[PDB]
């Protein structure tokens, strides 16, 4: 385990270590981390994406601690989660992350710390601050934290009216090194948020990435600007993003039309409170009739199915992310004047759509990407208030991150797949038991 | 003759509203018409070989009955645009089909269901009579027209009438259009005539001007602000020419795209300086029928950066569609907007969504303009910030030739038509403002 | 009576459109009216002592001529609104000035310029006739009506009809209002009657619910989002009874202000938890007639923070005006919004602009709702997501006392008025949906 | 000082490379205009107008501060004296040392600013000499001006618009090492590129008033101006109003300029405006007494505006005078229009008739200063030659006290600049063609 690392974990588990105790703990010289290796980035060349196996490319390595810099924190990570970006990274698609690290390392000697022949992955965490760098006053050793994954330098003026517009804006653990699928992580302190006290470590680590994105994409004025009464088509409603978009639609007074591909996922949507659920596999939609042409009759068939649930109304908003396969239909079925908001292209990023439906019906396609610190704060605030709930289905140990990534790669999962890092077992970290007890049924709605 | 006395009063310049209210209406007026019986005369031909001179008739027609909230206008000039051309060759379908269907609705809509169709979706002229409830307009008022008519019985359009589900283009999906000596319009289509322009100039900006205004200037489109860089496709064409003028008048920089040196010269006459000739540059955005070439998106992006000092455009003014749309999405600045109101080259758009979401761009659909936007666009013409783009004017009897000229893209700017006006150059009552702007007013001649 | 035959047709429940078209129109109808010769009758009185019972008359009036784009409606029920009170005490100015100005536009608007004013800005009922150009509505249609009157001849209103320069409020700046057996409206005022509600229930939301929707929910007002904290003045009155519902159903947190424990109980019945009784707290925002007390602003702000865990509200839902408006601006969060549609306590607002500009706040003026917003607000009632808030119902002949109730702030929720309806409880045609929501529907009942 | 002279020689030569600046030895002191902590009570009992900045401002040699992460050391060629600088120099509303001391408790880095002297100045134009750790976008030799807003952004509040940050500092006012000195220390996210067609002192002039007017009038966080709009602009030849007038014209809108003298009206015409109201000549009396306004005077203003607009009411009112004018501002605004306010010069207790606000769906939008993106865009429009500086008079660094007195007593119609390292006026232009095109408007406020 390592003596210094074990002493850090014992401090956390004791429950009554003070900030000065964490400050006095000796730092280990290495930590265990899930990594990619630069020499292997071509190992899947010529394969179909589905045949690329994250278990072959993900390694469990001992890596040295990076040097702590200004505005940063070293964090002892109790738990993290698998995200799709973890899957993209592990199959080197659409491009290898080592290209991101190389470009990032050119900015300054500080960013050059990230340009290494291994890539520590992971874009969520829940844990405890161990150290803070120069200029940090809002966070201190011992603070229980979750982290959002926005990395912004904010030297350029572009990001000072919404930090997502920073030209050097990046995603921590994907376009930067020292991610959260490890025993320790390095983050900017303007990634830190207070851990929800009613959640376990693994529950608390599970919402950060997808919940923040869903909030900006659906709730905020920088995305679709949902209002009560809206009809919202939610693709992938029982996956990572969808498990929060569906909660936002319902808690916001809108009507979600949830799309899933199994009756088990349909049951979860009903457990969340949704009533209008479409099983795209039962319906057998074939939006593309061959490699280059779509089928407008299948767009219309989806549109008619939506109208069955809404009493003849077309959706005000489409919550997109599947990309090429569904995007033509998404644009077609949207109400006149409505919005398709997209943050991803899982099935393929070369989108095709019929612009007659977009311009003649005054629709818009809004590109959305993660969330600024304020939006991340607001999304985590709603979790802390028990208004939005974690969606954990299954938890793996850190050593099993390859199988966890394979689960998501092959769409075998529901909700979020969590990963224990330093936490020795599930169930630890709750310090608000009465709030937990109030919401326990919903907290566990995605569990196997 | 009653029509001649109307024309004499207009030409005198000093007739009063009561004088117009006292003039006796003619029993018929001269109009450019389609005939119901001929709607198949072009069957089998390619579109380019359909000759509007064969289908367009110069007839004497009776006056429609004036309804509530309508105006009878004495028309001094009008215009020929692509809509007029398509109707004149019965494309995509005969206009009589909609006139008949909608004419089943009520005795009011049935007025338009006739065996002839008076075409024309622009006018500049003088109000003669107004229907019941009209408050804003009276005989003698000098007017141009916004061609979009809405009934607004649905709530959908009451926060922006472009969301109304039942729009009609006057002179296309209605009868009694502007290519005639008289016309019938709703009073909430009327706009004040710019005083520094001639009749035919005032009738010219019309729908492409208000469409460009909504798409580029208004908050329902791109919401231009001074300092913005704007890529403007087809910058000497209809939409692009007004877009270029709006960019300059708003304190922004147009990056104008055209396909010939003559068109570049016209952009300079409008006041632009950053001009890209897409054919001289040889852009091949598509490699074959199914795959684009991102190296060519980037080559365009690098050329844009030559004019802007390294900056990428805040706004792309789109309308070519499939050929250009992938490049438009690529070159747009992080957080920027691609606004689109047409897809000339093809409506099946393909683009790389990684650039759109990773750089938080948006594609905003826009269509025509609501009446407030049409008013603001015409008001910027009236202020002398935006100028008409006439190349050539025909007499009413020659409307067939005017339509063929548009059909075969014979002029760089717009084609006007004199209706009652006996010659070009009449109707200016602000000679001081006109003198200031004469060179730009004539930039397309 | 031709009127009795119309009512019997409605009460039968199975008359067809053709039957309504064949019914003879009566030559007069009963109407609550003001009289032009009386607009000075309250000279020298304090507003409180002006009595709506003295100024409101029950008259037989002739039917107006039906014009293009209009509908003659048989009115089963209506409601009292505060503009009914304002009208009846001729404050801040006489409505006859509005009618005189309106009548100058055209011979059609001149129909409204009469020596009597038929009041009422809500209705639920049945269409009898439609004018020229009307295809979306026909006789026999069961309707409620919003009170926006827009002519839409000017370009100004074609990107949001509230900006029409000739925009008016039906029954307040126009004649032939809904507190009568018949009413004349534009057909673009008509919305489908919620089928699970009685006539009086269906007449009660229209005006205040539409306004609260534009003011709080829509992008033309405050643009509420879930997680917001919202200060709601008058939370158990007409506007507040809908604003509180929109806050809760939209996922936000209302801080409800009321002035009695009885009203606090209603707020809790609606689902609110953070309730401030301004009478129990004894706020005195004004030291005297010209100066406010920033210590009292701060005391309100501190009380709000007790409910929100130290957070200041994102939105203030204003309408009390002078008395509260300085506090509303002070307590709002940095970057937040004060949205106002009224000034009940006085329209000369005073506030400290340092708090507005240095904290980048905004004051958004809001007025009624365009047709799309009114449609959306009625849609949420029809879907059973927003509920009527009727507390008491009066017969048409007692409209004077109904208005006095509101004038003196003795009511809660909405006070309804029966017009043609001979009693309460009629008009439900969706009993299954009604039973699902009946407990909430009755939350305001005495 | 030899090292300081070598730095100035490099700048004046015009062709020093970045590596040349990196190799220049730093001086161990620099000349600076300072306040002294022990003198903060020297004006007690006096009326503000009689407090003399020439008595409180010192010309001192001071040591260089330690350069921290994300900071730059700048060789200052020119600076400015604004109202903020004047207030500091007379210890109003309180002594600036109070904040420097409290904030200096936070950390060793904030404590660098807690000193017995305070180097003032919230504008600069100059050349980057050194950059601290992590800096990417700036290097030695870069020609810069500064945005004076300093934010640490540890709170999430300001990450959708940094003006919502709860803990801003105005550099040179709530920080030390200001611009009225030969050297200055700023955060690199205060730096902006110097407009090449302007002199050092001209480039330092637009500063905060220009970017505040930009946010208030042009940006979507303020009034969101569009071409064709009619804009009522109070105080149109003053600081805020002069830039607002230029933004209105540059954006294709019509400014209706309000001033109080014929000489001020001439300046508005020099800027390119035509619609000008002299509020003193018209004799507006919006307030009848201390407590009641005169709506007939609101209407008289409204009628005068209509004379210039062909009968239209303004889409936007650019407010900042406050109590005296704010009732009229709300009344005359068009239905659906916006009153934007960023100050209350005449009094912050605003009174207005809310019937006009809600019945015509108007709004009052508070704006304050500018975030760094808005400051970049405002300076960019100066660099494009759309917006011009408004300098009236320039003093040498040694005369900064008299410069501050001139501003304190409103001696000039435009701005007062200060030469720091620059040995004379007129240096630093590297785009003479663009300057020639705009020379007349550039000098509109001389002298
Ligand atoms: C749905 C439930 C609703 C509720 O329950 S909400 C609570 C109940 N409701 C209330 O409490 C409010 C009741 N209503 C009122 O209090 C009054 O109507 C008030 C105060 C709103 C306006 O009062 P006005 O004085 O009538 O308005 P104003 O504009 O002064 O009109 C006369 C015009 O002054 C001129 N003029 C205008 N602007 C300008 C300008 N910028 N420059 C120059 N001249 C200007 C002319 O245009 C002139 O026209 P003319 O030359 O005469 O043709
Ligand atoms: N918080 C901060 O850090 C700062 C705040 N400020 C504030 O913003 C300022 C305004 O900016 P600025 O433009 O640079 O100041 P200026 O002195 O340069 O311009 C103001 C000109 O407002 C006009 N004005 C003043 N008082 C009245 C009135 N009662 N009625 C109508 N017009 C009036 C005058 O113009 P005219 O007589 O010609 O009509 C005045 O010359 C302040 O007055 C100040 O309160 C300034 C600096 C820093
Ligand atoms: N829905 C309606 O009722 C209606 C009515 C009129 C028009 N429209 C539509 O909107 C029209 C555009 O309006 P418009 O008046 O501006 O037409 P226009 O005057 O003919 O100019 C538009 C052309 O766009 C450019 N262009 C065309 N094809 C291009 C391509 N493949 N790649 C790059 N640029 C291309 C420009 O040319 P260069 O770069 O070659 O110089 C310009 O000629 C569409 O053509 C379409 O007809 C619709
Ligand atoms: N512009 C529009 O479209 C529109 C639409 C509807 C109404 N309105 C207007 O808003 C009105 C209120 O309308 P409403 O229908 O809701 O009337 P309402 O039923 O009487 O409700 C108002 C509530 O405000 C509170 N209140 C009254 N005076 C107050 C004061 N001085 N300070 C604090 N709170 C006070 C009372 O609540 P508590 O005593 O319990 O605190 C009362 O329940 C205005 O006067 C007006 O007519 C405007
Ligand atoms: N830009 C950002 O900030 C951001 C943030 C998070 C995620 N993302 C991206 O967004 C994508 C989804 O992320 P996630 O965490 O939600 O992953 P996820 O847990 O796997 O959920 C995706 C869901 O999409 C559906 N789906 C998958 N392929 C589909 C297809 N071809 N057609 C229709 N539906 C399909 C759902 O399944 P069923 O219909 O089968 O039930 C699946 O549960 C990923 O590409 C990820 O990289 C982007
Ligand atoms: C052709 C009719 N039609 C138009 N839009 C749709 C739709 N979304 N869904 C189904 N049918 C439709």
PDB file of N, CA, C and O in Angstrom, chain B residues 63-89:
ATOM      1  N   UNK B  63     -61.346  46.069 -60.257  1.00  0.00           N
ATOM      2  CA  UNK B  63     -60.813  46.326 -58.922  1.00  0.00           C
ATOM      3  C   UNK B  63     -61.401  45.349 -57.910  1.00  0.00           C
ATOM      4  O   UNK B  63     -62.608  45.093 -57.921  1.00  0.00           O
ATOM      5  N   UNK B  64     -60.581  44.795 -57.027  1.00  0.00           N
ATOM      6  CA  UNK B  64     -61.120  43.974 -55.943  1.00  0.00           C
ATOM      7  C   UNK B  64     -61.908  44.835 -54.971  1.00  0.00           C
ATOM      8  O   UNK B  64     -61.746  46.057 -54.904  1.00  0.00           O
ATOM      9  N   UNK B  65     -62.780  44.178 -54.211  1.00  0.00           N
ATOM     10  CA  UNK B  65     -63.503  44.859 -53.146  1.00  0.00           C
ATOM     11  C   UNK B  65     -62.574  45.061 -51.956  1.00  0.00           C
ATOM     12  O   UNK B  65     -61.871  44.133 -51.540  1.00  0.00           O
ATOM     13  N   UNK B  66     -62.563  46.276 -51.417  1.00  0.00           N
ATOM     14  CA  UNK B  66     -61.664  46.617 -50.323  1.00  0.00           C
ATOM     15  C   UNK B  66     -62.217  46.093 -49.000  1.00  0.00           C
ATOM     16  O   UNK B  66     -63.359  46.390 -48.631  1.00  0.00           O
ATOM     17  N   UNK B  67     -61.409  45.308 -48.291  1.00  0.00           N
ATOM     18  CA  UNK B  67     -61.835  44.681 -47.060  1.00  0.00           C
ATOM     19  C   UNK B  67     -61.350  45.407 -45.822  1.00  0.00           C
ATOM     20  O   UNK B  67     -60.655  46.424 -45.903  1.00  0.00           O
ATOM     21  N   UNK B  68     -61.722  44.903 -44.643  1.00  0.00           N
ATOM     22  CA  UNK B  68     -61.270  45.536 -43.400  1.00  0.00           C
ATOM     23  C   UNK B  68     -59.757  45.437 -43.256  1.00  0.00           C
ATOM     24  O   UNK B  68     -59.155  44.393 -43.520  1.00  0.00           O
ATOM     25  N   UNK B  69     -59.148  46.539 -42.827  1.00  0.00           N
ATOM     26  CA  UNK B  69     -57.715  46.555 -42.617  1.00  0.00           C
ATOM     27  C   UNK B  69     -56.889  46.426 -43.878  1.00  0.00           C
ATOM     28  O   UNK B  69     -55.759  45.931 -43.818  1.00  0.00           O
ATOM     29  N   UNK B  70     -57.424  46.855 -45.018  1.00  0.00           N
ATOM     30  CA  UNK B  70     -56.728  46.778 -46.292  1.00  0.00           C
ATOM     31  C   UNK B  70     -56.607  48.167 -46.906  1.00  0.00           C
ATOM     32  O   UNK B  70     -57.273  49.116 -46.487  1.00  0.00           O
ATOM     33  N   UNK B  71     -55.726  48.281 -47.898  1.00  0.00           N
ATOM     34  CA  UNK B  71     -55.491  49.538 -48.589  1.00  0.00           C
ATOM     35  C   UNK B  71     -55.435  49.291 -50.090  1.00  0.00           C
ATOM     36  O   UNK B  71     -54.899  48.274 -50.540  1.00  0.00           O
ATOM     37  N   UNK B  72     -56.014  50.209 -50.856  1.00  0.00           N
ATOM     38  CA  UNK B  72     -55.881  50.223 -52.305  1.00  0.00           C
ATOM     39  C   UNK B  72     -54.810  51.243 -52.663  1.00  0.00           C
ATOM     40  O   UNK B  72     -54.921  52.418 -52.290  1.00  0.00           O
ATOM     41  N   UNK B  73     -53.778  50.801 -53.386  1.00  0.00           N
ATOM     42  CA  UNK B  73     -52.580  51.600 -53.626  1.00  0.00           C
ATOM     43  C   UNK B  73     -52.446  51.878 -55.115  1.00  0.00           C
ATOM     44  O   UNK B  73     -52.595  50.964 -55.933  1.00  0.00           O
ATOM     45  N   UNK B  74     -52.171  53.130 -55.467  1.00  0.00           N
ATOM     46  CA  UNK B  74     -51.770  53.452 -56.834  1.00  0.00           C
ATOM     47  C   UNK B  74     -50.266  53.223 -56.956  1.00  0.00           C
ATOM     48  O   UNK B  74     -49.479  53.869 -56.251  1.00  0.00           O
ATOM     49  N   UNK B  75     -49.863  52.311 -57.840  1.00  0.00           N
ATOM     50  CA  UNK B  75     -48.492  51.804 -57.868  1.00  0.00           C
ATOM     51  C   UNK B  75     -47.689  52.543 -58.930  1.00  0.00           C
ATOM     52  O   UNK B  75     -47.987  52.436 -60.127  1.00  0.00           O
ATOM     53  N   UNK B  76     -46.632  53.243 -58.498  1.00  0.00           N
ATOM     54  CA  UNK B  76     -45.711  53.891 -59.427  1.00  0.00           C
ATOM     55  C   UNK B  76     -44.614  52.958 -59.923  1.00  0.00           C
ATOM     56  O   UNK B  76     -44.186  53.090 -61.078  1.00  0.00           O
ATOM     57  N   UNK B  77     -44.145  52.023 -59.091  1.00  0.00           N
ATOM     58  CA  UNK B  77     -43.090  51.099 -59.501  1.00  0.00           C
ATOM     59  C   UNK B  77     -43.176  49.814 -58.687  1.00  0.00           C
ATOM     60  O   UNK B  77     -43.795  49.765 -57.621  1.00  0.00           O
ATOM     61  N   UNK B  78     -42.535  48.770 -59.202  1.00  0.00           N
ATOM     62  CA  UNK B  78     -42.491  47.461 -58.559  1.00  0.00           C
ATOM     63  C   UNK B  78     -41.142  46.818 -58.894  1.00  0.00           C
ATOM     64  O   UNK B  78     -40.178  47.512 -59.232  1.00  0.00           O
ATOM     65  N   UNK B  79     -41.073  45.488 -58.814  1.00  0.00           N
ATOM     66  CA  UNK B  79     -39.812  44.767 -58.944  1.00  0.00           C
ATOM     67  C   UNK B  79     -40.096  43.371 -59.475  1.00  0.00           C
ATOM     68  O   UNK B  79     -41.230  42.889 -59.416  1.00  0.00           O
ATOM     69  N   UNK B  80     -39.055  42.725 -60.002  1.00  0.00           N
ATOM     70  CA  UNK B  80     -39.100  41.309 -60.357  1.00  0.00           C
ATOM     71  C   UNK B  80     -37.998  40.599 -59.581  1.00  0.00           C
ATOM     72  O   UNK B  80     -36.816  40.928 -59.738  1.00  0.00           O
ATOM     73  N   UNK B  81     -38.240  39.628 -58.792  1.00  0.00           N
ATOM     74  CA  UNK B  81     -37.393  38.795 -57.940  1.00  0.00           C
ATOM     75  C   UNK B  81     -37.685  37.324 -58.225  1.00  0.00           C
ATOM     76  O   UNK B  81     -38.527  36.988 -59.062  1.00  0.00           O
ATOM     77  N   UNK B  82     -36.858  36.501 -57.629  1.00  0.00           N
ATOM     78  CA  UNK B  82     -36.925  35.067 -57.920  1.00  0.00           C
ATOM     79  C   UNK B  82     -38.324  34.507 -57.696  1.00  0.00           C
ATOM     80  O   UNK B  82     -38.764  33.615 -58.429  1.00  0.00           O
ATOM     81  N   UNK B  83     -39.038  34.978 -56.694  1.00  0.00           N
ATOM     82  CA  UNK B  83     -40.390  34.493 -56.478  1.00  0.00           C
ATOM     83  C   UNK B  83     -41.245  34.808 -57.692  1.00  0.00           C
ATOM     84  O   UNK B  83     -42.006  33.995 -58.095  1.00  0.00           O
ATOM     85  N   UNK B  84     -41.160  36.029 -58.193  1.00  0.00           N
ATOM     86  CA  UNK B  84     -41.945  36.377 -59.375  1.00  0.00           C
ATOM     87  C   UNK B  84     -41.589  35.463 -60.544  1.00  0.00           C
ATOM     88  O   UNK B  84     -42.471  34.957 -61.250  1.00  0.00           O
ATOM     89  N   UNK B  85     -40.296  35.236 -60.759  1.00  0.00           N
ATOM     90  CA  UNK B  85     -39.860  34.371 -61.856  1.00  0.00           C
ATOM     91  C   UNK B  85     -40.444  32.969 -61.702  1.00  0.00           C
ATOM     92  O   UNK B  85     -41.033  32.422 -62.644  1.00  0.00           O
ATOM     93  N   UNK B  86     -40.297  32.365 -60.514  1.00  0.00           N
ATOM     94  CA  UNK B  86     -40.806  31.007 -60.306  1.00  0.00           C
ATOM     95  C   UNK B  86     -42.301  30.928 -60.600  1.00  0.00           C
ATOM     96  O   UNK B  86     -42.765  30.014 -61.293  1.00  0.00           O
ATOM     97  N   UNK B  87     -43.077  31.871 -60.067  1.00  0.00           N
ATOM     98  CA  UNK B  87     -44.506  31.883 -60.357  1.00  0.00           C
ATOM     99  C   UNK B  87     -44.755  31.954 -61.858  1.00  0.00           C
ATOM    100  O   UNK B  87     -45.589  31.218 -62.397  1.00  0.00           O
ATOM    101  N   UNK B  88     -44.023  32.828 -62.553  1.00  0.00           N
ATOM    102  CA  UNK B  88     -44.251  33.020 -63.986  1.00  0.00           C
ATOM    103  C   UNK B  88     -43.970  31.770 -64.811  1.00  0.00           C
ATOM    104  O   UNK B  88     -44.442  31.679 -65.947  1.00  0.00           O
ATOM    105  N   UNK B  89     -43.207  30.818 -64.284  1.00  0.00           N
ATOM    106  CA  UNK B  89     -42.974  29.553 -64.972  1.00  0.00           C
ATOM    107  C   UNK B  89     -43.614  28.390 -64.213  1.00  0.00           C
ATOM    108  O   UNK B  89     -43.273  27.232 -64.440  1.00  0.00           O
TER     109      UNK B  89
END
